[PDB]
């Protein structure tokens, strides 16, 4: 690419660093999702919450990369580290871990805003609108859940009831759809391949209406 | 977890290795997507294709992890390496790279099937049905695209027309929906937070019908 | 205003006093609402109940002022004192506080009825129909809730389950709509201001039908 | 509450002060509403406008309190002073009073923004988006009304015609709905109380559909 | 352009001159629109009328340029002068100014018709049908408004009532729609840019029906 | 106007200067539109794009003037200069010209934001939200088009295919509606004029429904 100008290089470097931070957070949500789906754990609410969190983090990383590309910069990708701890004694530890991660993300975003505030107004507005609001809302939600868990306790069937309630409230908002793909079903109908005749299909449809 | 039995440990280790391979492929698709979206490249068809491929690979990794968890095993996650090359001279190089990756994936899957064939019939059936068909179909599609590109050439406006056609045929099958999240809009309406009243909303809806 | 006759001045003074009492009750509900919405409390049911109570008290004060104005009197407003206690150890204390406030309101209303009974029949009918019924019903509801809470206990997850149930039953009856306002969105469309062309809009609508 | 951290204490104090300012403005609108509804005044347009203004101010105070609670702070409520003047010679004086109040509110908000600008980006964005826009729009509308009134005059039937027009344009935007409550109607049907069987009702409804 | 023949050069020059006259009239309507929208004027009817007039004049200039291009000529653009007076004592002066401008436009059009009448029949028909009718109708409307204003007077609330009526009658005929544009909302969905995938969208739509 | 206070005079002057800049850009788009519509050029896509750009620039100028009027200032209009060059060798030159103009606009807006940042928070928010986003998006789109054109070439039928595609994608978003006007058709039906009976028509319509 013979064009990487306009955008300030230091801001570009900091943006790429934050992109990698978001990718690491998305990866770490996967480990929690896998941990709580074991046949000896079977906690449906935590599973749904962790899946939703991982998808949200991936979308945030994609959005920041798209913003960097819109201003005319380049994005360089590097190594993604493995999560350190892959087990939790109870729900309180997991919620505390998530709260600490949110605080770290907010600190990084504030540093970015401070860096880009003097020159680029649009960049600072993007930082303070499209990236911070989600973090603030998620932090409030997680803090409320943590307070409720601390009040309820950690023995008996209290955690089970809490998990059922959490699954109910999470499923009312998020539901991941399936990703379509290709297969060898009906081989005799798609001889070269399935996609190559798409245009033709469109013509057929117009003749039906 | 005091339960990790039944599933053969060697098969579990090989399955985890293949999961990491799929995750690496998904990560590498992101670099191509970012490369072809630069303001000095602006190739819409390649962008759509790479986005679709990354989502497909992520779904495949999730499916294999779910199968391991269903049989009673554990999944341990480790480091994801960075892609080596992040630039391509023309479309032919990118398509060749993808074809080679597909061949590597197929070889790994065949080794897995050979390992698990003697004892576990269900595992071998899962390998040969739910994992190989997608790879075979994608390999055929990519080979057809590569042959067409080689016939067309690499100079003039041929690649531009090919890219427009590719975008048209890809968009007829895949369209990634947005992931819902939380925000601070309408603060006075969701005082503790937005999710905590979900159950109440349901009751209201029943009274309306 | 050169007209303040007909209505008995002593009745007018007592009515104004009761209006200020209702306003004070409405203000005190706000403190409870703010207390139970803290991130370290997060009790959704109590929040909904307190919000509903504050709105009900405000409506009652408005109704009494409207009745005074209908009979030809004047309303003079004075200072609203701050609530004394702004913290509660458990739900039982809050419910007891509300019950005591209801008893005080009922005593004041009975005194008003006694004052106005001899001369004005319409005023006494208004007092005994439009002001007392709400208080009686609310007192019964709060007493039932208090008895249930005392039976349940104050330790473990009993209060959490009670709070969830309370939110469910309150939300089935009350939902505060948003108050519309003015903004600077679409500045080029409402040049003087948004309201000044309302009449014109009406004409347009008639031409569409 | 063992948690009041994160939020800067000086910003919290200033926010609470502004909350009390908004509450005072909401209270003062009530006096104007009561003044213009007397049987010797009977100005419908001014009544509607003052009612709308009081509701808007109350909503603004609620929104600021909710924002403070979301960031993890506490809200402490204090005394609300009585309005000073409770009579106006003509509409021009009332409109001038409202304009001056709007200017005072804007100055306070600007001071808040200056205080919180250096450290918290999200707080400053909230101040400049969710609080200032309404004030600017309302100030423009009130200034336009004041200019029209000054041009029209103050004698004859000019003010009366203006009052009809104002009522017409205000009523096209705002309409306060009734607040539901409890009563003793149909006593034999709701024996413990009306709310306690809400869940049961829902089941019945599902069986009807 | 190696083709500028057929069309008579003198007619082309006169047409370009009239195009610039229409553009100047459109520009001058903007100043009146801005003058009557000040917070110390706030005349909604005059604002609507001036906005409509400016749009009409711009459309007329576009139509004349299109006619010149259809016959095979060229259009050369030059400087647009500023309006001389930017204030008016009352509505009568503004209406008189508009009437005088209409008379000037009609004189110019008559000169054009005289110039092109001998040779080109189609050009003269275009002048007498597509350009004069609007001017005649607008002149009649403005003269009627001026007579009504002169009869009404210039003191009291007469002009204000007239302004409401004018706004009502203008708004029943004209309403300028918003012009769509591009933005950075939903950045993650339109990665290269929003327009480049339009064709693909069409295919998707056909598959839905 | 005896009222021009509140708004800072230096900010007002800078705003008026930027308004004139936007008007000049809108005027210059007209010359390109006229150039590409000649019978010896006949490029439909460029014609549509230039028409859309001119309308967008006019709307932006109107929006900035409306914002100045809302804050209580005055707008003074001056002379609009003629465009310098009115011919282009190929599409690349036109796209480069547009990109340079966008860069100039962005620099001016950044200077405005710097000027108004210290005192007025609402003004700076308006600058960074309602004026910069459009420029950023349009710059990205034009850069993508320029890169595609440079890759395609400048000889043969490549530009023709590109122009057809550009027309297709532009027309999917923008379509300028006709501006209604007055005429002398059906003279016997609208005797004084067409508008004067509008109110009566409304009554008739109500009687039909």
Numbering used by the authors:
A (entry chain I), B (entry chain E), C (entry chain J), D (entry chain Y), E (entry chain V), F (entry chain A): 22 to 230
Wording from the paper:
We provide a structure of full-length artemin at 2.04 Å using single particle cryo-EM coupled with cell-free expression. Therefore, octahedral symmetry was imposed in subsequent steps of 3D reconstruction and refinement and led to a final map at 2.04 Å at 0.143 FSC. In total, all residues for artemin except the first 21 N-terminal residues were modeled. Although prior molecular dynamics simulation studies suggested that the C-terminus of artemin forms α-helices that extend inwards into the cavity of the molecule to fill the space, our cryo-EM map of Flag-artemin and the corresponding fitted atomic model clearly show that the C-terminal residues do ultimately turn inwards, but they first hug the inner surface of the core artemin shell before extending only partly into the artemin cavity. Artemin’s loop L′ contains Pro198 and Pro201 which potentially prevents this region from forming into a helical conformation and helps favor the interaction with the inner surface of the shell. A third proline in the C-terminus (Pro213) provides a kink that results in the C-terminal helix F (aa 216–229) turning into the cavity of artemin. In our experimentally derived model, the artemin dimer is oriented similarly to an apoferritin dimer and a disulfide bridge exists between Cys61 and Cys22 of neighboring opposite facing monomers. The overall octahedral symmetry of artemin shows an extra stabilizing interaction relative to apoferritin where the L′ loops or two monomers form a hashtag arrangement that connects the 4-helix bundles from each monomer in addition to the ferritin-like L loop interaction between two monomers at the outer surface. Somewhat surprisingly, loop L′ and helix F extend and contact neighboring dimers which differs from all prior reported homology modeling efforts. This results in helix F from each monomer forming a second 4-helix bundle toward the center of the complex.
